[PDB]
C-alpha cells in the first residue's frame, strides 16, 4: 500500500512521488542555513524514529500529501 507525497528536493522528477510513507527532512550542514527536503520513503523507516538533533530532524507520515507544508525545527 503506497501513498502519494509532495516531492520537493533536488532528486524529484516532478511535484509528487509515491512511496510507503511521506517524509520531511530538515538538515543543517556546518556553516550553512538549514535546508528542507520533502519526498517519499520506502526504505530506512528507522530514520523516521530518531530524536531530533542540532543538525537533523526527520518527519514521516502516511496520509495523502501529508507532508505538503509541514515545517520542522532543529534543536538549539
Amino acid at each position: 500500500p503506497l501513498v502519494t507525497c509532495t516531492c520537493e528536493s533536488p532528486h524529484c522528477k516532478g511535484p509528487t512521488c509515491r512511496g510507503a510513507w511521506c517524509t520531511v527532512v530538515l538538515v543543517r550542514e556546518e556553516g550553512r542555513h538549514p535546508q528542507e527536503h520533502r519526498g517519499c520513503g520506502n526504505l530506512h523507516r528507522e530514520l523516521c524514529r530518531g530524536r531530533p538533533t542540532e543538525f537533523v530532524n526527520h518527519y514521516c507520515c502516511d496520509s495523502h500529501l501529508c507532508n505538503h507544508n509541514v515545517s520542522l525545527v532543529l534543536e538549539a
Binding site: P10, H11, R28, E29, E30, N42, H44, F55
Partner: protein, 104 residues
C-alpha cells in the same frame, strides 16, 4: 552537483590499450560524479553505514568524511583482442561500463 552517472568516453589509444585491444577503438564507460549530501536518496541505494557516516559528517566534518558517489553496477562490453598475436572475440569483458551509481 549531486551524485549521478555522467558521460565518459574512453579512447583505448589515449591510454595505450590499443596495443592489445583491437576493437572497438573506444567506448562509453560513464562515470559517477557529484556529492552525496544528507539525506541520501533511495535511488542511490545507500547502505546503513553510508547513512550513519553521512550523519556523523553532518555533526562534525572532521570526525568522518561524506559518503562517496561510486558505481554500484557495472556492465560488460564486447571486444576483439590479441591473444599471442591471434585476434580473438571476447563476448563479455566484465566490469567496463557504469550502469548504476550509488552512495557508499
Amino acid at each position: 552537483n549531486y551524485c549521478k552517472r555522467t558521460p565518459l568516453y574512453i579512447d583505448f589509444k589515449e591510454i595505450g590499450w590499443d596495443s592489445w585491444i583491437i576493437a572497438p577503438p573506444g567506448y562509453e564507460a560513464y562515470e559517477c560524479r557529484g556529492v552525496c549530501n544528507y539525506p541520501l536518496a533511495e535511488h542511490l541505494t545507500p547502505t546503513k553505514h553510508a547513512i550513519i557516516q553521512a550523519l556523523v559528517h553532518l555533526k562534525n566534518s572532521q570526525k568522518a568524511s561524506k559518503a562517496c558517489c561510486v558505481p554500484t553496477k557495472l556492465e560488460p562490453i564486447s571486444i576483439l583482442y590479441l591473444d599471442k598475436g591471434v585476434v580473438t572475440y571476447k563476448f563479455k569483458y566484465e566490469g567496463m561500463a557504469v550502469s548504476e551509481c550509488g552512495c557508499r
